[PDB]
């Protein structure tokens, strides 16, 4: 929204810049004017051939006589016109170069200054300004916005003025050569442009807004894949696949509808363009027959005007570029124009000599820029004598730290004054104040250079001797000298990560080189290991003795030797004095003391589309006919102007133009049938395979096992994304693009055949020119990307030293040396700057060359078309045909290059989509193999089981686990902690096969058993049961698949689960929807429903996994009642955490490190004394404690 004044934005352009912009915009306007003048001559050439064209055919008597005057007229005329064209070429060359070069130069020269000034501004801000802003946003703002400004003030302006120049220049010629056709052209204007826009808009449909259509299926997919273990457990995979397929079924229908409508739209647009395009020309002819206009003039005005009209549409985008650039320049200049109260880049105020260091804080009220919400310091009085060392203590609020914060004048206080020596702190120069004051912080920071350099950030002028004495006086010499590279070692976030105390010592050394008169030490001893603490403490103590010092920490080991200790309460100073006195005071201090004591060949994806042998041949045959229909447009326009130029006796002309203008439209209407076809056939072909692909992908995704779904690589979102994109992507490749390419090769093919057979060597010449300018056009874009990438790599390095500077800023301001970072920034920038100079030199040549080549190519066109070809019997009407045909073909070929990146992306996206189908699991639920035993009664034998999770094969969960549980009895399972208790339930369901050991049910190994049938006999119940969105009866009936469950059955189950109270209470009753789409319920109801699901299956094996985990009060009671009523008639395994509710169990089994430790009935484990007794004692101790 917020923009910037036009003159402000260019404030850094002066002298040569303004000149460059002037000469540039001049040259640009000329370059603009250049083109419509070319089309002006094109009419004069037509008139030359027209005059001879009429006279040549008017004879029918003498022949040799026509070999004289005609050829002479063509000689002088064609020579003149060719000379002029050659004239225009050099012009456009020069002006193009001037234009792009100059504008780019101005851009560079300005942007450089912008960057420098801006970074300076950033660095010049006061801390309060940072405390209220996001640094990341600010750095990204720098690097991103300056680029926008660059894109703004760049060569885009030149293009804008050039476009405006073609616009005016076009319309001027258009009008002056004739007023009628221009108005007639303007009459049809409010349709054609809109249509073209519409088409361009419709063909942008591949980007992902299809989410609106897919989201319905995407929701199913998401809730499924998010609930994968439940659908796996209950084996409802066929159902989920079915649902997904149905949603896809809808999606494809909506798709084909959209296809139909869009194709109709595009076709209609094309028809309107055709119709108006022809109509204008028919009116043209209608004006030529009246001899009001010359045939060539018609062309001149037509083309000049249409050029001029297109110029606007082509101009518009550069407006947005400059427009965005002001907006970006607003927030940038806002920092640069901003002047702080503190500065620190100012040379002003006193720089006192012989500072004795007598500090006093007088009546200081302060609050950080959270402002009125909190006032931390309510008044204050503190004095510290010269040479002394004062220690500040406090319980909380860190009001202690505030004084250190203020003593550097990072903030000016609300009311009151901080006074170093006798003078107010605000009178003395900031930098000098920062220089006389040394600082050591809790978290020390090191910038990424050598140790010497980090010690050199204390003072720019220093020698390794002073460094040595500095670190040695900080006793850091040893530890660093042992380190390799000596002083030349590295430090920072990347590389050479060191002990905190060492870094702190380097920080103290750095601070020591500063040789300050005032020392501030805030918690530097705190947040550090006890051993090295003393090592650094020695340094800190050695860092004093020549200075006055204020120290703050939580370590009362370092306070005793202080001359004065000071206690705060609610920002109010209270206790001051020596230790013994403060202990005699028995105040806050004493209190605290006592308290602290990619590309490859994938045909099979096309082989999958081979399901439709038809629908493709139709579209290709149709699109090839369209391809053959395309140049027919050019053949007509050739003979329209051709016969009219080759007319001779006029009487026959007016009748033929009507026959053509008719036909001219006839290829139009027939273009509606063909375009809609190839678009509809390919479209419908796209939406079907999208069903087949997404169906074959999703299906095979339900095939995979829990091992694959626990992978960090594959999460629900990632899977849905991978599911959507690939299928969405292959469609674009197999879709429109192909049809268009075939249409285009067909186009150029028919065009070139016609052109080739008509013009001998006329075509052969052009075919030598066109590919050279095309390739010359591609190579330019390659250099553009190269220079772009290289430039990105250079400013990345300068932006890296900016991020380092503005992130750790609060430290750099304390050490000053911002000017250092200024200089480093500048030097970092200087390389891109010289690079940007070369950029303009190149951007110009490549542009002017491609332009000049196109204009010179046009000179060869008519020069060879005339002269050598026209001196022969070969005629103009064919020349006009060949040019159209050939360059049409080429400009159609352009789309080939334009449509190249689609397949590349599709391949990568098609590379994944075939692999995901062919991947096979260790355990597949789809295999119909497996025993399917006939005997009901279930036991469970765990024997010598060892299990490590495939995601984490480090710490093993099970090691030689062995359990046995007879039928119709409850197996309680207690454990210290972890999934060791649950892994049982997981393995029984066979989500995994254990590493070693085995597990049986009826005596048969589950491993050789059927997976589905195995899981079919299990009544799993988890902690937080997931219910899908549908009738609660459909959620309950989910317990049993391959058969629809009865109402009275789900009633019986609901009656068993004791949920009926809710179910008979609701308005919808059993048809009520649950799962947050339609209704909300608490955990109790959900769980009871899970119980219903469990026992409608009528399992022989119930598995209750911490069912009462998330629950409270009576809910636990009723749910436990239900769960209790659920078991006792079945084999079951209960791992619940309420041991009070396990007191009734046939067999309790304490697990330990994967081995069963204690096992037996309650009273036996209670007769024993060990883990279980402790487990039961501790938690019973809590219930007794709550009284």
């Amino acid at each position: 929204k917020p923009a910037v004044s036009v003159l402000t934005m260019f404030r850094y352009a002066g002298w040569l810049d303004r000149l460059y912009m002037l000469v540039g915009t001049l040259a640009a306007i000329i370059h603009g004017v250049a083109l419509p003048l070319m089309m002006l001559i094109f009419g004069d050439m037509t008139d030359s051939f027209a005059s001879v064209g009429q006279v040549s055919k008017q004879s029918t008597q003498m022949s040799e006589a026509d070999k004289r005057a005609m050829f002479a007229k063509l000689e002088e005329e064609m020579t003149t016109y060719a000379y002029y064209y050659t004239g225009i070429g050099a012009g456009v060359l020069i002006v193009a170069y001037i234009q792009v070069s100059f504008w780019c130069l101005a851009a560079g020269r300005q942007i450089h200054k912008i960057r420098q000034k801006f970074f300076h501004a950033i660095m010049n801000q006061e801390i309060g300004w940072f405390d209220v802003h996001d640094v990341g946003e600010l750095n990204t703002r720098l690097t991103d916005d300056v680029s926008k400004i660059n894109e703004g003030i760049g060569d885009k302006i030149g293009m804008f003025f050039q476009a405006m120049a073609t616009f005016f220049g076009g319309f001027i010629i258009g009008f002056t050569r004739g007023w009628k056709l221009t108005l007639v052209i303007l009459a049809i204007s409010p349709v054609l442009g809109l249509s073209a826009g519409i088409w361009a808009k419709i063909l942008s449909s591949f980007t992902d807004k299809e989410l609106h259509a897919y989201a319905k299926a995407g929701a199913v997919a998401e809730e499924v894949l998010a609930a994968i273990r439940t659908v796996i457990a209950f084996g409802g995979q066929k159902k989920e696949l079915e649902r997904y397929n149905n949603n896809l079924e809808e999606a494809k229908r909506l798709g084909i509808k959209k296809a139909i409508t869009a194709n109709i739209s595009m076709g209609a647009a094309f028809l309107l363009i055709y119709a108006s395009y022809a109509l204008a020309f028919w009116y043209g002819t209608s004006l030529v027959i009246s001899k009001e206009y010359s045939i060539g003039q018609v062309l001149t005005v037509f083309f000049s005007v249409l050029i001029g009209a297109f110029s606007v549409g082509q101009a518009s985008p550069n407006i947005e570029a400059f427009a965005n650039a002001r907006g970006a320049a607003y927030e940038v200049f806002k920092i640069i124009d901003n002047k702080p109260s503190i500065d620190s880049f100012s040379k002003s105020g006193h720089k006192p000599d012989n500072i004795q260091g007598n500090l006093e804080f007088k009546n200081i009220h302060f609050s950080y820029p959270s402002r009125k919400e909190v006032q931390i310091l309510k008044g204050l009085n503190l004095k510290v004598k010269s040479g002394q060392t004062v220690a500040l203590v406090g319980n909380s609020g860190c009001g202690k730290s505030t004084t250190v914060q203020l003593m550097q004048r990072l903030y000016d206080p609300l009311d009151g004054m901080v006074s170093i020596d006798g003078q107010d702190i605000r009178t003395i120069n900031v930098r000098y104040l920062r220089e006389i004051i040394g600082v050591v912080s809790q978290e020390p920071v090191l910038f990424a250079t050598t140790i010497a350099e980090n010690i050199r950030y204390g003072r720019e002028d220093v020698t390794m001797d002073e460094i040595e004495k500095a670190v040695k006086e900080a006793n850091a010499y040893d530890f660093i000298m042992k380190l390799p590279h000596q002083f030349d070692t590295l430090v920072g976030e990347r590389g050479a990560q060191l002990s905190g105390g060492q870094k702190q010592r380097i920080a103290i050394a750095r601070a020591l080189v500063r040789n300050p008169k005032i020392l501030l030490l805030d918690e530097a001893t705190s947040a550090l290991d006890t051993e090295s603490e003393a090592v650094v403490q020695a340094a800190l103590d050695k860092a004093r003795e020549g200075r006055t010092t204020i120290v703050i920490a939580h370590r009362l080991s370092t306070v005793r030797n202080a001359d004065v200790i000071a206690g705060f309460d609610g920002g109010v100073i209270v206790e001051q004095g020596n230790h013994d006195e403060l202990m005699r005071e028995k105040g806050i201090y004493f209190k605290l003391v006592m308290t602290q004591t990619p590309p490859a060949s994938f045909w099979r994806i096309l082989k999958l589309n081979s399901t439709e042998w038809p629908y493709f041949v139709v579209g290709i045959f149709c699109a090839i006919i369209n391809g053959g229909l395309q140049p027919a447009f050019s053949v007509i326009f050739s003979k329209v102007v051709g016969v009219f130029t080759n007319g001779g006796p006029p009487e026959t002309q007016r009748q033929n133009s009507n026959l053509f203008s008719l036909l001219f439209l006839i290829l139009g209407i027939i273009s509606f049938i063909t375009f809609f076809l190839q678009g509809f056939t390919f479209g419908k072909a796209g939406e079907i395979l999208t069903k087949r692909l997404r169906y074959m992908v999703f299906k095979s995704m339900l095939r995979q096992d829990v091992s694959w779904f626990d992978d960090p690589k594959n999460t629900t979102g990632a899977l849905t994304t991978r599911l959507a994109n690939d299928a969405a992507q292959v469609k674009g490749a197999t879709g429109s693009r192909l049809a268009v390419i075939f249409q285009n090769i067909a186009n150029l093919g028919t065009g070139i055949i016609i052109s080739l057979i008509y013009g001998w060597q006329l075509t052969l010449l052009l075919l030598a020119i066109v590919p050279i300018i095309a390739i010359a056009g591609v190579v330019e874009m390659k250099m553009l990307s190269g220079q772009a990438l290289k430039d990105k790599k250079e400013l990345e390095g300068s932006g890296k030293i900016a991020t380092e500077a503005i992130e750790n800023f609060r430290t750099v301001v304390s050490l000053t040396r911002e000017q250092k970072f200024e200089t480093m920034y500048a030097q970092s920038l200087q390389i891109p700057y010289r690079n940007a100079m070369k950029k303009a030199h190149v951007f110009g040549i490549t542009f002017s060359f491609t332009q000049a080549m196109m204009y010179f190519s046009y000179a060869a066109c008519f020069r060879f078309g005339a002269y050598l070809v026209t001196q022969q019997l070969m005629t103009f009407e064919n020349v006009l045909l060949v040019f159209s045909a050939i360059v049409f073909g080429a400009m159609a070929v352009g789309q080939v290059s334009s449509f190249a990146p689609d397949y590349a992306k599709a391949t990568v996206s098609a590379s994944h989509i075939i692999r995901i189908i062919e991947k096979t699991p260790e355990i597949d639920s789809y295999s119909t193999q497996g025993l399917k035993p006939n005997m009901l009664e279930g036991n469970v034998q765990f024997s010598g089981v060892v299990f490590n999770y495939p995601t984490r094969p480090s710490i093993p969960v099970l090691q030689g686990l062995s359990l046995e549980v007879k039928k119709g009895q409850t197996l309680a399972l207690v454990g210290s902690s972890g999934c060791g208790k649950s892994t049982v339930v997981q393995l029984l369901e066979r989500f995994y096969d254990p590493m070693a050991g085995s597990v049986f049910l009826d005596g048969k190994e589950i491993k050789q058993l059927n997976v589905q049938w195995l899981r079919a006999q299990l009544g799993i119940v988890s902690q937080e049961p997931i219910l899908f969105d549908c009738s609660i009866a459909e959620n309950i009936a989910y317990g049993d698949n391959s058969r629809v469950v009865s109402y009275e059955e789900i009633v019986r189950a609901a009656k068993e689960a004791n949920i009926h109270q809710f179910i008979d209470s609701l308005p919808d009753k059993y048809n009520t929807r649950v799962g947050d789409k339609g209704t909300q319920l608490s955990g109790g109801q959900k769980q009871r429903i899970a119980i219903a699901r469990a026992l409608v299956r009528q399992p022989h094996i119930l598995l209750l996994d911490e069912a009462t985990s998330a629950l409270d009060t009576e809910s636990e009671k009723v749910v436990q009642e239900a769960l209790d009523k659920a078991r006792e008639g079945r084999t079951c395994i209960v791992i619940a955490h309420r041991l009070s509710t396990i007191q009734n169990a046939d067999l309790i089994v304490v697990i330990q490190n994967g081995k069963v430790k204690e096992h037996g009935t309650h009273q036996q484990l209670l007769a024993q004394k060990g883990i279980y007794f402790s487990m039961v004692s501790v938690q019973a101790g809590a219930k007794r404690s709550l009284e």
Binding site: A196, W199, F270, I273, Y277, F310, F633, A892
Partner: peptide
């Protein structure tokens, strides 16, 4: 994709 610019 005929003259003026689609």
């Amino acid at each position: 994709x005929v003259x003026v610019x689609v």
